[model samples]
Target: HMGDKSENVQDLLLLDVAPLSLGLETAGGVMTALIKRNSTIPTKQTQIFTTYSDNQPGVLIQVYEGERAMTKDNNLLGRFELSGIPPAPRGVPQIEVTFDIDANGILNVTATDKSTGKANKITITNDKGRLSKEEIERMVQEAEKYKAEDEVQRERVSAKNAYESYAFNMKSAVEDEGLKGKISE
Candidate 1:
C-alpha cells in the first residue's frame, strides 16, 4: 500500500475583451479600423494608407476606441500622424503600421513605410487606478451612513400606513350606533 498527500497544480486565468473594435478618426469625421478585440493579448495588426487630397504629403491620424464608424461616435484616445514624406503622386505612400501590447496590458504603436523608411512610435498608458485606501474608506463610511438614513425613512413610511389603517377602523366603529351604545353601557 502507498499513500501520497501531493496536490495537483492548477492555474487561474481571467481575461476580459472589449465589446468593439478600436479605430481612428479621419478628416471627414470617419473612423478607421485598427484592431479588433478578442483577437489575443500581445497581438500585432496593421493597415495600409494613402493621401486623400492632391499635394497632400502627410495624413493626420487620430486614434479612438469604439464600435462606431464615425469619429464623433467613438471615444478619442490620442492623435498623431505621419509627416515629412517625399510628397508622392498622391495616394502612393506605403504606411506599414504595427500595434504591440505587452504583458502589463499597455499598448505601443509603430508606423513605417518601406519606400521612405520613415517610422513613428507612440506608447499609451491608462491611469485609471489612482485612488488611495483612505478614499475607499471614506466612501464606505458614507455608504453606511446613507444606509442608516434609509432605515429611518422606511420606519416613517410604515408608521404612516399603520396610523391611517387605525384611523379608518375608529371612524367605522363610531358610525355604528349599536356598537357605540354597548361601549357606553
Candidate 2:
C-alpha cells in the first residue's frame, strides 16, 4: 500500500552499517572483527574465545572500532571484564561473546560463560566508537569519490593476502602452519 508493486522485503530496511569494524582486542593486540564494516545495522554477531592461560578465570574485553590491524590503531570503545569463570584449563571453557547494534544506534554487548552458565551484558551509552552525522556523511562522500578505485583496493588486498599465504606456506613448512594460528588475524 505504501509503495508501488515490488517483491518482499530486502534493503528496504533502513538499517546502516558501521563505517569501521567493531570487535574486541584479542591477544597480541589483534582485533577480532565480530562485525565487519558494511554490515547492515541493527544486527548481531557472535564469537567464541578461550583463555590463554591455564585455569584463567578473568579477562578484560576491550572493544574497538576502526580499519587498523592493531587494537591501539583503532579507537577504543570501552572495556569490561568477566570473572568467576570456573577455573579450567586454557581453551577448555567456552566464553561466548555477542555484539548487537540496535535501532537507536547503540550497541548491546553480552558475554556468557557457557560451562558455568554465567552471563554479563552491557549497553553502550556514550555513543562509543561511533562516527557523527557529519562524519558519516563525509564517509559516504569519500566512498563515492573512491568508488572507481574499489576494485583496485579489493584486488590489492586480495593479492597481498595471496602473497602472504604463499610466503607463509613456505615459512609454515618450516615452522608449523595456520592462519588459524592467529584467530583474530
Candidate 3:
C-alpha cells in the first residue's frame, strides 16, 4: 500500500565502513586519528587545531590514511592549504578541520580559520585504501577454488582406503571356517 515507498528507501540504503584510518598529521609527525578504520561511512568528524609557530601565515593540512602511529608510515591521500589566517600568538587562532566521507567512499576535507572565517577544502576522488569490488570477487573465487581442490583430494584418499579395506575384509571373510565350506573354487 502506501508503505511501499518506505520499503524501497530501506532497500536503497547500502551499509559501508571505512577501510582504513584517516586523520591529519600533527606535531611530532603523529597521525591524529579523526576517523578510525571500520567506521561507518557517510560520517562527519571535526577537530580543532592551532599553529605552533607565532604569526604563521598559512597552515598545511596533510591528509593520510593508515593504522600507523606516525605519518611517515601511512599513505598520504592529499594536502590543502588554508592561508590568510589572522596573525596571532601561537595557539591563539582556532582552525577547525573537518573530515567528511560519503557512502561511495569519497572523502571531502575542509579547513576553516575561525578567526578570519576563511575556509578551503579538497575532494579525494580516489579511494586508494579500499579494494575494488572486482578484486574482492577474485579473492573469493581463488579461495573457493582452493577449497574445492582440497576437498576432492581428501575424498579421493578416503575412497581409495575404503575400496582397499573392503577387498581385504571380503578375502578374509571367505577363509572363515563356516564360510570355507560354502565357497566354490
Candidate 4:
C-alpha cells in the first residue's frame, strides 16, 4: 500500500479525579479526621487550617492521621502548602481547604488560593487504616469488654463503703418522709 506520509499521535488522558479527606493533628497529638473513613463516596468536608507559630509566612500542612504527628510516626499520605498567606500573628490566617471524595474512592482536594482568584485542586490517597467490617466489629467487642470490666470494678468499690454509707445516711434523713406516698412498689 502506498499513501501520503502521515503519523498517528497517541494521546495521554486522565480519566477521573477523586477527593481526599483532610485531617489535621491537634495539640493533644491526636489525628482526628474531619471526614470519617468508609463514608459514602463522593463526599466533601472543609475545615479551617491554622498556623501553629507566629510570624509565619505560610503553613506547611502535612495531612495525616493515625495517632502521631511526625511524618515517620504516622503514614505520610500527602503534603500541601498554603503559601503567601498574609504574614500575621499566629492563629490569624484563615485558610479553608475543601475535601471531595469521588466515586472511585479517591480524594480530590480544593482550596481557596488566597493569593490567586482561582481555586487549586489536588488529589491524594493513602492505604492506611483500611479495616473490614468484621475486623472493626471484633475490635469494638474487645474494647467493650474492657469498658464493662472497668464499670463492674467501679461499682464494686463504690458499694463497699462509700455507696453504702451514703445510702444509709440518706435513708435515715428521709425515713419519716411518708413511704406510703413515695414508695413505687
TM-score of each: 0.48, 0.53, 0.53, 0.45
Worst 10 residues of 4 by lDDT: 12-21
User: Residue-wise lDDT of candidate 3 within 88-184, one digit each (tens)?
Assistant: 5664445578877756555678777656667787887654445666643553455335555545545654676577776443534455455346567
Relative to the true structure, candidate 3 reaches a TM of: 0.53
lDDT of 2 by residue, 23-84 (tens): 76444333467787678465788887643543546434677665444444456667776777
Q: What lDDT does each candidate get? A: 0.55, 0.60, 0.60, 0.51
**What lDDT does candidate 2 reach at residue 18?**
61
- Model 1 stretches astray by more than 4 angstroms: 1-16, 25-30, 38-42, 54-59, 86-94, 130-185
Ranking by lDDT: 2, 3, 1, 4
Which residue window of length 10 is worst by lDDT in model 2?
7-16
Compared with the true structure, model 2 gives a TM-score of 0.53
Cα deviation of 170, candidate 4, in Å = 47
Output the TM-score of candidate 4. 0.45
Model 1, position 162, has a per-residue lDDT of: 76
Highest-lDDT candidate: 2
Which model, 3 or 4, shows the larger lDDT?
3
Q: Give the count of colliding residue pairs in each prediction.
A: 0, 0, 0, 7
Cα RMSD for candidate 3? 26.7
